[PDB]
Structure 1
Amino acid sequence: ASLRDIKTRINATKKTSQITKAMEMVSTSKLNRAEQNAKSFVPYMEKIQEVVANVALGAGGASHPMLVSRPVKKTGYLVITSDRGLAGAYNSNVLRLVYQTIQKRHASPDEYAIIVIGRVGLSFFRKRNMPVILDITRLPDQPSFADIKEIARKTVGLFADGTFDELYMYYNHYVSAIQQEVTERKLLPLTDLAENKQRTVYEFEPSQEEILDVLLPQYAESLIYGALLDAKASEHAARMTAMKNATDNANELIRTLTLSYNRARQAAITQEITEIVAGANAL
């Protein structure tokens, strides 16, 4: 092509590299600020779980650990996604796995039940026809427990009163800052715990059952919030690595186009010199 042809594409690709690098820096700072909330959350979850470790053992339960396990009636499923893209296959992995597993295990809309977080999940389920019940459209880049608390309370209440059988949350974990992958876990029935008794005889000032009946929903809300924090960290790491690879590829394209431009302009120049020399020689 021409030098005029090459320059425009070089300009566009350089601007793209600039924008991608800027977004990478922003995501880096966001990840740094995002890990602090997980650090703050860990003690709360551990301190509630250690109390559970003796309060919730040795008893039938309040239909949470009883494993009411109604076979198939809109058992809940939690999907946590981003709101803006540029994260690679981050949202695609979660939505793909959720759709495949839910279509394999369930086959009637009355047996189905989904709760979704983020815009892209809704934007994809509109392409599909799934029965969404409720949603949270946006969440600040540093979400607190109180930010999601009301919807967590709504979902746990729907689990209560026999309306919802049991819940699974599907979200992304991260092995490191560079690798993020999916997990799912069966949440409300709480099939696993550990046993230790310190003040097991009397921690129960109103009674044994009453404190448990209200302690369990708050515990489930804490679990959902922890999953949310892990999903947010995975999202920021994913955008970091995606923008890094995008900038690398754009720089490779810069290198190729620049070599082509430099090699074409030299041929044009030597053509001009040949024309001058021949014109002089003709006289």
Structure 2
Amino acid sequence: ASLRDIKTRINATKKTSQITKAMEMVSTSKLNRAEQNAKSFVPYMEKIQEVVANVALGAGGASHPMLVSRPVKKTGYLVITSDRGLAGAYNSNVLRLVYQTIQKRHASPDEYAIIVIGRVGLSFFRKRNMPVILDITRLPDQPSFADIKEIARKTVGLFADGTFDELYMYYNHYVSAIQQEVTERKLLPLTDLAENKQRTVYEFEPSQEEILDVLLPQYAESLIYGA
């Protein structure tokens, strides 16, 4: 009974298996390329860390909106999701963590704003009609700095203008090929910046205030790119 049914079912399952195998191989190759890009990026972040810590540390730190804690009335959240499904809990973990953090910290929509990277996050947030500010979708599978420079700079400018007082960012961290874990990081202000390898003697050729003015947005943009 249902012999034709079973045969058709078997054929469909075989074709599905082949398609999924091909997708797995493609994913492996693209993961290797992504690791290569991260390895390329690392030294720039290292040097930026060194310069930022050396300049900020000491009596010359003084005060700056991106450097010192403003009074907190609002909070910005930057969430990074994918554009294509079939990735497992990669989006669910981030979205659930962000939802629970928002529900614990705030009660009114005016207390927070959301910046979403990814097509998945848009639908999740607008299903509940949560606040949304700006978005970018359909990035290349191997993004470059030019693809997100504008959005990172716009977010930094929004922080500078006082649109919101503190900025948080959530993303999945690639600990290993089997496990990926979500993390929360604080971008602005640059609180709890640890010490450098050694205190510097860099003479502030322009005013160190102008040094900070130039340096801080680039630091935030680099952090966004690394995440």
In the superposition, the TM-score normalised over structure 1's length comes to 0.75
Q: Could you tell me whether the CA contact under 8 Å between 2:68 and 2:191 is conserved in 1?
A: no
Instruction: Check 1:18–1:116 CA distance in 2 against 1; reply closer, same or farther (3 A cut).
Output: same
**Which structure ranks higher in relative contact order (CA pairs < 8 Å, sequence separation ≥ 6)?**
1
Return the offset for 1:18. 0.8
- In 1, Cα distance between equivalents of 2:6 and 2:103: 49
Deviation readout 1:145-174 (Å, 9 max, x if unpaired): 111011000001111132221111100002
Greater CA drift, 194-203 or 116-125 = 194-203
- TM-aligned CA deviation for residue 54 of structure 1: 1.2
Work out the CA distance in 2 between the residues paired with 1:33 and 1:197. Answer: 32
Q: Deviations over 1:199-240 (max 9, x none)?
A: 8444311111111111011001100110xxxxxxxxxxxxxx
Give ranges in structure 1 of 5+ residues lacking alignment.
227-283
**Pair member with larger Rg:** 1
Tell me: CA distance 1:46–1:169, structure 2 relative to 1, closer, same or farther (3 Å). Answer: same
Mapped partners of 1:178, 1:13: distance in 2: 26
Give the conservation status (yes or no) of the 8 Å contact 1:68–1:165.
no
Contact 2:76 2:166 in 1 (8 A): yes
- Post-superposition offset of 1:73: 2.8
Percent identical among aligned pairs is 100
Distance 1:56 1:184, change over 3 A: same
1:32 and 1:56 mapped to 2: Cα distance?
36
Give, in angstroms, the shift of residue 67 of structure 1: 6.4
Q: Do the aligned residues in 2 keep the contact of 1:173 with 1:180 (CA within 8 Å)?
A: yes
Separation (CA, whole Å) in 2 of partners of 1:182 and 1:222? 19
* Pair 166,63 (structure 1): closer, same or farther in 2 beyond 3 Å: farther
Contact 1:119–1:138, Cα closer than 8 Å, also in 2: yes
Distance 1:92 1:118 in 2: 13
- Other structure's SS at 2:57 match: coil
Relative to 1, partners in 2 of residues 1:148 and 1:66: Cα closer, same or farther, differing over 3 Å? closer
Q: Contact (CA 8 Å) 1:169, 1:184: kept in 2 or not?
A: yes
Change (3 A) 1:64 1:107: farther
What SS is found at the alignment partner of 1:110? helix
CA displacement at 1:46 relative to structure 2: 0.6
Q: Distance in 1 between matches of 2:66 and 2:118?
A: 32
Q: Distance in 1 between matches of 2:164 and 2:46?
A: 26
- Residues 72, 111 of structure 1: 8 Å contact kept: no
- Could you say if the C-alpha distance between residues 63 and 168 of structure 1 is closer, same or farther in structure 2, counting changes exceeding 3 Å? farther
What is the CA-CA distance between 1:130 and the residue it aligns to? 0.8
d(CA) in 1 for partners of 2:70, 2:192: 19
Q: Structure 1 residues 62, 106: CA separation in 2 closer, same or farther (over 3 Å shift)?
A: farther
Q: Shift of the alpha carbon at 1:180?
A: 0.5
Q: How does 1:174-213 map to 2 (within 5 A)?
A: 174-196=174-196, 200-213=200-213
Distance 1:66 1:91, change over 3 A: closer
Q: TM-score, normalization: structure 2?
A: 0.92
Tell me, yes or no, if the aligned pair for 2:78 and 2:114 is still in contact at 8 Å: yes
Instruction: Name whichever structure is richer in helix by fraction.
Output: 1
Give SS of 1:115's match.
Answer: strand
SS in 2 for 1:193: coil
Q: Tell whether the 8 Å contact from 1:75 to 1:164 is kept in structure 2 after alignment.
A: yes
**How far apart, CA to CA, are the structure 1 residues paired with 2:209 and 2:58?**
12
Q: Distance in 1 between matches of 2:172 and 2:61?
A: 31
